[PDB]
Amino acid sequence: NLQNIIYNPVIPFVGTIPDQLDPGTLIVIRGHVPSDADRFQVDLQNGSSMKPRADVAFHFNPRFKRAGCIVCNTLINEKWGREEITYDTPFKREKSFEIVIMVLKDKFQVAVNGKHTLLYGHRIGPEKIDTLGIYGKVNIHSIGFSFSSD
Amino acid sequence: NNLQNIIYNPVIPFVGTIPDQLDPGTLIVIRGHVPSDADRFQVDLQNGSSMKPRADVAFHFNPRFKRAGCIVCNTLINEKWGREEITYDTPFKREKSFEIVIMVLKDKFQVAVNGKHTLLYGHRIGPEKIDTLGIYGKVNIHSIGFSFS
Ligand SMILES: OC[C@H]1O[C@@H](O[C@H]2[C@H](O)[C@@H](O)[C@H](O)O[C@@H]2CO)[C@H](O)[C@@H](O)[C@H]1O
Ligand SMILES: OC[C@H]1O[C@@H](O[C@H]2[C@H](O)[C@@H](O)[C@H](O)O[C@@H]2CO)[C@H](O)[C@@H](O)[C@H]1O
Ligand SMILES: [Cl-]
Ligand SMILES: [Cl-]
Ligand SMILES: [Cl-]
């Protein structure tokens, strides 16, 4: 059911999501971490404004320093909320990945390389998300959606 | 019989509490028969048993028998149905017995009937929210049991 919106995008990438993130929607992102990455992020946004910065419903932020971790959070009206830090991370420098974000009624579920990684409860209604951004030190092969509606 | 909380010949419609969480690898095993004149039946994995307002249905597994037959799968959230996922390759038949095995995975249900893979259904509600098994419609149930993880 997977409809890619882009292949091999320049980073940072900001694109419109062409349908609503209804429960059962999948987001699939394939890419590769450069050898000298410190971090990258996948942001599910309400719009693409820079000034002031668009709300980030779901900020998914792998960080590579020390033992590595993933930080998840939400940006509302240019303020970050409570960090949810996952210390069990599958990402590594100079390694390829496939991220699958499953949109559920109450939360996102993320799996990497076919293995569950983390959950993150909705803080912004997922119906408000219309934009996906990818930022930081990462190579992206593809970004696709499997919409519930299709 | 390694199954757990086995019930025979429940009264239909059946609404029962699932006796443990639907963790990955959990099985729900339902043996029964399709009446000769069935239109449809359903197996519903529900968040509670409220009738009004109607409990959320994480997984509605709905064999339909008109025309060439099919299985409709869907989810009910806050009393509204989502987009149907229709399986046209259906193993069910009027007057035929079945054994349904629902395997719960972290990201989907995997359903087999009489030992044959039937369909996949990706989660729309987290399966940890499911505490209730409903069986409704034109169907005969011989047994229900579970294999937990
Ligand atoms: O919360 C996501 C957000 O983190 C910012 O950095 C935080 C940092 O994670 C924390 O350990 C420190 O105590 O506060 C910092 C200031 O906000 C990042 O700057 C931002 O890009 C997001 O990743
Ligand atoms: O989707 C499950 C749901 O279907 C309802 O019937 C649908 C029907 O399948 C569809 O063809 C039509 O467009 O809308 C009907 C109402 O949503 C059933 O009423 C319900 O019991 C479930 O089986
Ligand atoms: Cl940021
Ligand atoms: Cl949920
Ligand atoms: Cl119904």
From Swiss-Prot, chain B:
<feature type="binding site">
    <location>
        <position position="64"/>
    </location>
    <ligand>
        <name>a carbohydrate</name>
    </ligand>
</feature>
<comment type="function">
    <text>Beta-galactoside-binding lectin that acts as a sensor of membrane damage caused by infection and restricts the proliferation of infecting pathogens by targeting them for autophagy. Detects membrane rupture by binding beta-galactoside ligands located on the lumenal side of the endosome membrane; these ligands becoming exposed to the cytoplasm following rupture. Restricts infection by initiating autophagy via interaction with CALCOCO2/NDP52. Required to restrict infection of bacterial invasion such as S.typhimurium. Also required to restrict infection of Picornaviridae viruses.</text>
</comment>
<comment type="subunit">
    <text>Homodimer. Interacts with CALCOCO2/NDP52. Interacts with PDPN; the interaction is glycosylation-dependent; may participate in connection of the lymphatic endothelium to the surrounding extracellular matrix.</text>
</comment>
<feature type="site" description="Critical for binding to sialylated and sulfated oligosaccharides">
    <location>
        <position position="54"/>
    </location>
</feature>
<feature type="binding site">
    <location>
        <position position="74"/>
    </location>
    <ligand>
        <name>a carbohydrate</name>
    </ligand>
</feature>
<feature type="domain" description="Galectin 1">
    <location>
        <begin position="14"/>
        <end position="147"/>
    </location>
</feature>
<protein>
    <recommendedName>
        <fullName>Galectin-8</fullName>
    </recommendedName>
</protein>
<feature type="binding site">
    <location>
        <position position="84"/>
    </location>
    <ligand>
        <name>a carbohydrate</name>
    </ligand>
</feature>
